[PDB]
Design an enzyme around this catalytic site. Structure first.
Site, PDB file in Angstrom:
ATOM      1  NE  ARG A  64      -2.787  -1.082   3.272  1.00 18.96           N
ATOM      2  CZ  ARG A  64      -3.092  -2.173   3.967  1.00 18.96           C
ATOM      3  NH1 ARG A  64      -3.886  -3.150   3.497  1.00 18.96           N
ATOM      4  NH2 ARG A  64      -2.551  -2.323   5.192  1.00 18.96           N
ATOM      5  CD  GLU A 101       1.177  -7.861  20.010  1.00 21.86           C
ATOM      6  OE1 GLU A 101       0.488  -7.843  18.955  1.00 21.86           O
ATOM      7  OE2 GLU A 101       0.794  -7.380  21.103  1.00 21.86           O
TER       8      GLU A 101
HETATM    9  N1  LIG Z   1      -5.431   0.254  12.256  1.00 21.33           N
HETATM   10  C1  LIG Z   1      -4.862   0.090  11.069  1.00 21.33           C
HETATM   11  N2  LIG Z   1      -5.554   0.294   9.944  1.00 21.33           N
HETATM   12  C2  LIG Z   1      -5.035   0.137   8.717  1.00 21.33           C
HETATM   13  N3  LIG Z   1      -3.788  -0.262   8.512  1.00 21.33           N
HETATM   14  C3  LIG Z   1      -2.987  -0.460   9.571  1.00 21.33           C
HETATM   15  C4  LIG Z   1      -3.486  -0.307  10.930  1.00 21.33           C
HETATM   16  N4  LIG Z   1      -2.542  -0.669  11.741  1.00 21.33           N
HETATM   17  C5  LIG Z   1      -1.467  -0.985  10.978  1.00 21.33           C
HETATM   18  N5  LIG Z   1      -1.752  -0.866   9.660  1.00 21.33           N
HETATM   19  C6  LIG Z   1      -0.855  -1.194   8.537  1.00 21.33           C
HETATM   20  O1  LIG Z   1       0.384  -1.818   9.022  1.00 21.33           O
HETATM   21  C7  LIG Z   1       1.456  -1.187   8.261  1.00 21.33           C
HETATM   22  C8  LIG Z   1       2.787  -1.318   9.123  1.00 21.33           C
HETATM   23  O2  LIG Z   1       2.669  -0.369  10.166  1.00 21.33           O
HETATM   24  P1  LIG Z   1       3.889  -0.121  11.357  1.00 21.33           P
HETATM   25  O3  LIG Z   1       3.308  -0.864  12.624  1.00 21.33           O
HETATM   26  O4  LIG Z   1       3.863   1.409  11.433  1.00 21.33           O
HETATM   27  O5  LIG Z   1       5.091  -0.794  10.795  1.00 21.33           O
HETATM   28  C9  LIG Z   1       1.011   0.253   8.006  1.00 21.33           C
HETATM   29  O6  LIG Z   1       1.835   0.909   6.991  1.00 21.33           O
HETATM   30  C10 LIG Z   1      -0.444  -0.020   7.665  1.00 21.33           C
HETATM   31  O7  LIG Z   1      -0.450  -0.423   6.269  1.00 21.33           O
HETATM   32 NA    NA Z   2       2.324   0.598   4.870  1.00 19.26          NA
END
Ligand SMILES: Nc1ncnc2c1ncn2[C@@H]1O[C@H](COP(=O)(O)O)[C@@H](O)[C@H]1O
Ligand code: NA
Ligand SMILES: Nc1ncnc2c1ncn2[C@@H]1O[C@H](COP(=O)(O)O)[C@@H](O)[C@H]1O
Ligand SMILES: [Cl-]
Ligand SMILES: [Cl-]
Ligand code: NA
Ligand code: NA
Ligand code: NA
Lengths: 179, 179
Positions: A64, A101
């Site tokens: 994405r 996690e």
């Molecule tokens: N609540 C959420 N809604 C939509 N996408 C999420 C959400 N939580 C995490 N993501 C996705 O998880 C990816 C990795 O996030 P990170 O934990 O910042 O590495 C993000 O770039 C989003 O694509």
């Molecule tokens: Na992302």
């Protein structure tokens, strides 16, 4: 003016409760992508923001992230460099692993696509924990690239990623925020 | 004019022999993405081609397809709708499975993102066997969308995909071709 544009973007994003599991409020950017007005404004605002920044490359993570970083790259007139899950890039890569996690994952980048001197903007759809972006930043910095800016459509500040990126010397800009 | 632009695009694409396995000549679009001139021309030429076509939506498949379809969507001023591997889309989906050499895979689309009346352009990075695009087309047609055009950066005509898509009533346009 901008408050109105920012609102139209925020309103275009759908929230799906309890996906992928109970408790999570999933923020679905596909409703934004399908609205040409909201999508085009998103890219305008992210690329406007860095228009005088000296950026020479944009880096986005699969999948994405590609949807926001590559259009920003085209709007700034700079090359786009993907960071991918392992085994998807065909030329020479380095990799970084990042704790989840449970378990670990890994991201890779083409060693030839960043070199000393490059000023790199990271662009992604959403900032949650910051783990993917932290790994991306370490990849770009291993290759001699300078990165101090990451841009997102969405920030989830309760999950701590902005905080974590701050500690790596990254400034984050997001269009919208949810709680 | 265009022969020169088409050549510069073709020259920007690297070929990695024997990846992912011996015999395959992998055509690497990342060298194109990293060249702002080649990338921008790619999108210009694909979106120029359909400028009078009446398109109301662009559909691209994950993940490299996103890199070409979403910028075409923005250039035409239409919404972008992703087709994804299973379990990645949060709202209601349908799915289609497609035979691979060994095994099967599946693609999904949001049922709300296509409706009767939509004229849909599919855009992808590369046409090989055509199996992913055939499954995408069946998804869009199940939802009432009209699709008769798929556009690619690269066509590998020896692998038969153009032929297969012809039999579904799809016209294919590619910028470049390799043997
Ligand atoms: N609540 C959420 N809604 C939509 N996408 C999420 C959400 N939580 C995490 N993501 C996705 O998880 C990816 C990795 O996030 P990170 O934990 O910042 O590495 C993000 O770039 C989003 O694509
Ligand atoms: Na992302
Ligand atoms: N020789 C190749 N070089 C690069 N990518 C390829 C090659 N063969 C297949 N692909 C990829 O496989 C995807 C699915 O192709 P298809 O067999 O047309 O469903 C394409 O969209 C390409 O991303
Ligand atoms: Cl490494
Ligand atoms: Cl189904
Ligand atoms: Na390098
Ligand atoms: Na593809
Ligand atoms: Na529908």
């Amino acid at each position: 003016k901008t408050a109105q544009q920012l609102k139209y973007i925020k309103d275009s994003i759908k929230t799906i409760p309890d996906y992928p599991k109970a408790g999570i409020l999933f923020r679905d950017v596909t409703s934004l992508l399908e609205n040409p007005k909201a999508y085009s404004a998103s890219i305008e605002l992210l690329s406007e923001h860095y228009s005088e920044s000296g950026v020479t490359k944009v880096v986005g993570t699969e999948a994405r992230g590609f949807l926001f970083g590559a259009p920003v790259a085209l709007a700034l007139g700079v090359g786009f460099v993907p960071v991918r899950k392992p085994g998807k890039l065909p030329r020479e890569t380095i990799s970084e692993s990042y704790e989840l996690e449970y378990g670990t994952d890994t991201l890779e980048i083409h060693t030839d696509s960043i070199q000393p001197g490059d000023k790199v903007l990271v662009v992604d759809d959403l900032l949650a924990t910051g783990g993917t972006i932290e790994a991306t930043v370490k990849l770009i910095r291993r290759l001699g690239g300078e990165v101090v800016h990451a841009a997102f459509i969405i920030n989830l500040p309760e999950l701590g990623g902005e905080a974590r990126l701050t500690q790596q010397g990254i400034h984050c800009y997001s269009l919208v925020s949810f709680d």
